[PDB]
């Protein structure tokens with residue numbers, strides 16, 4: 001059931017913005033670890049005396065890394081005279097965010113038809129405003145409302161190149177790395193209470209609950225009309241045998257925030273080969289792999305979708321596989337991206353639901369809680 | 384003239400500590416860019432609820448990257464019950480340092496015979512105390528005094544593995560990168576006034592002025608008894624044709640601080656080949672190279688030290704060459720390590736002064752201000 005109840009026209013995920021202490025070092029690490037190219041900048045060299053912002057791209061995926069300069073560089077400016085390229089930026093907010101949460105996502109940005117209308121309708125329907133609509137060079141409109149914690153939902157609309165005031169990066173600085181990542185599939189938040197978080201966000205967006213076909217969490221997914229903007233939300237389940245990883249997140253993050261970004265790959269085998277080669281030389285580490293019993297059990301579950309050789313490749317790379325009634329999901333998770341056990345990344349590829357591929361084909365891997373738990377108990381028995 | 388006036392026994396540079404917002408991302412970037420191996424850690428996985436600290440090593444060079452966790456994790460601790468492995472660490476000081484200065488060096492650490500004696504003698508001779516001597520696991524003593532700005536001189540002494548409470552890193556996480564860097568040669572501070580800075584530091588150390596054989600700075604070098612701990616200090620010269628880069632540093636850093644670290648390489652050609660290959664894939668960028676006229680002029684200046692092929696290799700890599708009356712220096716400078724135009728790195732190799740090599744052989748490259756200026760004017764004439 002998809003009631004198509006979006007209260008304004010939503011296109012696709014546009015970018016994700018990380019708030020950093022040093023944008024340069026985070027952006028360079030992420031570029032090498034994920035195979036993303038340096039594509040635009042806004043910093044002292046472009047006249048921005050307020051913040052340093054570096055944009056990485058891979059296909060349609062856009063990661064923005066922003067850090068504040070000394071406020072003394074811009075102390076004489078006011079908002080009408082600002083040199084910041086992102087008018088919602090505030091030195092105090094950014095330093096407070098980073099001190100509270102450490103490295104993490106500040107903005108989940110979606111492209112809409114009209115960001116001023118999206119903002120007005122959202123606030124009329126309960127959204128807490130964060131930054132009012134601002135028109136940049138008569139060409140782009142940006143507005144922000146609160147999503148959860150200190151994460152904002154950012155609306156961007158284009159009259160017709162990332163943002164005005166950003167410059168394309170020199171060819172020499174822009175090495176054409178590419179490990180196969182192509183777009184953001186979903187972005188997941190952790191909150192203390194799922195019910196009120198869903199009511200709030202669905203209330204101001206009109207996003208509907210996406211259908212899904214004891215492990216420490218309850219979750220639900222909100223989706224746009226064509227189900228290409230997907231926003232899962234998790235809450236902890238307390239009193240469990242093992243402590244909820246959602247609760248550990250909330251403790252180390254100092255509250256609600258973005259838990260993981262799932263990045264679609266056009267070739268998950270190539271992406272993981274390339275990422276795993278770089279894990280110990282500046283890139284990202286991956287969670288420990290399932291036992292061999294998990295891959296032996298894959299034949300019964302997805303033997304009509306993957307060949308034995310393709311299953312063997314999943315085992316080589318530690319890929320997890322899940323299936324719903326409509327399609328199949330290949331997924332794997334990194335270790336946390338920074339110092340705190342908070343945000344991490346998921347790499348995914350979806351098989352099926354061809355009509356274009358429909359959004360969320362194969363689900364989100366909820367079946368892998370039980371399948372991994374069974375295979376580890378079975379591997380103890382094998383031993 | 385070397386009066387050997389050290390007021391306590393000093394051995395060698397021991398480590399450099401960076402204060403970061405996210406230690407993981409800075410350490411991974413530096414590891415890949417400089418070819419340093421992950422060698423020790425102190426973090427949540429080792430029981431440290433206060434700070435994350437990651438140690439990189441290349442030869443005898445040790446870089447420590449430290450960032451604070453949420454204070455809530457350790458809110459019930461007091462100094463007698465702390466889980467921090469570096470007892471001088473303070474959440475507030477670290478956040479204040481990073482907000483003020485951005486990514487940069489907090490501590491220049493030297494190994495001494497007795498850190499408690501070094502501390503006591505230094506303070507008796509005018510040093511401003513920063514952290515009193517603390518004995519760690521009855522095995523290592525650490526103490527800190529102010530050096531300049533918010534940079535401290537850290538004394539470490541060992542009864543007889545980096546520090547107690549640090550753990551060696553897993554072989555899988557510890558890829559054996561090595562681009563040829565072997566030790567810290569010198570560490571340079573920028574201050575508003577050179578005279579009072581030299582009087583203060585030489586006053587409490589007994590370090591002597593190291594002999595040197597219009598461009599925006601005045602500088603002097605302080606040296607230990609065997610001239611293996613070398614601490615140059617720069618001040619701006621105002622009213623110049625081009626604005627002093629020392630003054631630009633002071634503005635963007637919010638005052639005095641560490642300007643550059645010079646890292647000795649056992650094979651500067653290999654080091655720069657390896658570093659330049661990685662500049663656009665997560666590593667470090669280098670300053671623009673001298674014009675060909677500079678390398679043509681090298682024959683007259685160092686043609687008795689370097690062959691034509693060795694000079695051609697310097698030209699390929701953009702290496703600068705300088706000479707004093709005792710030896711020859713090969714050097715090159717990176718672009719700033721982070722967002723702000725503040726700290727950068729120098730790679731150096733010294734030729735001559737064999738007796739071991741004596742410290743500071745060939746000087747610090749002061750002759751390269753005029754030689755680069757002449758060669759750029761000459762290259763305009765060639766054109």
Ligand SMILES: CN(C)c1ccc2c(c1)Oc1cc(NCCCCCCNC(=O)c3ccc(C(=O)C4=C(O)CCCC4=O)c([N+](=O)[O-])c3)c3ccccc3c1N2
Nearest residue numbers: 188219232234242260333346364365366368369372373376
């Ligand atoms: C000493 N000795 C030798 C030893 C002794 C005893 C044990 C032992 C060793 O061994 C173990 C190992 C464990 N460890 C197994 C780890 C299982 C956790 C698997 C998580 N699995 C996912 O598959 C998943 C899927 C989707 C999403 C995802 O993306 C997503 C969304 O997008 C939206 C909707 C919500 C959502 O979750 C996400 N995710 O992270 O978000 C994750 C144990 C665990 C529990 C109890 C005992 C254990 C034991 N006994």
Ligand SMILES: CN(C)c1ccc2c(c1)Oc1cc(NCCCCCCNC(=O)c3ccc(C(=O)C4=C(O)CCCC4=O)c([N+](=O)[O-])c3)c3ccccc3c1N2
Nearest residue numbers: 571602615617625643716729747748749751752755756759
């Ligand atoms: C438009 N159009 C086409 C154009 C027009 C006009 C010009 C033009 C183009 O072109 C240029 C280029 C310039 N740019 C040349 C840059 C020269 C700077 C070289 C710095 N050179 C070092 O060699 C060094 C050595 C040692 C240490 C070091 O390590 C150290 C220590 O360890 C301890 C002691 C102190 C110390 O310094 C360090 N260092 O950074 O610390 C550094 C100009 C500059 C000035 C005026 C006009 C310029 C021009 N006209």
Ligand SMILES: [Co+2]
Nearest residue numbers: 188262346364
């Ligand atoms: Co997911």
Ligand SMILES: [Co+2]
Nearest residue numbers: 571645729747
């Ligand atoms: Co130098």
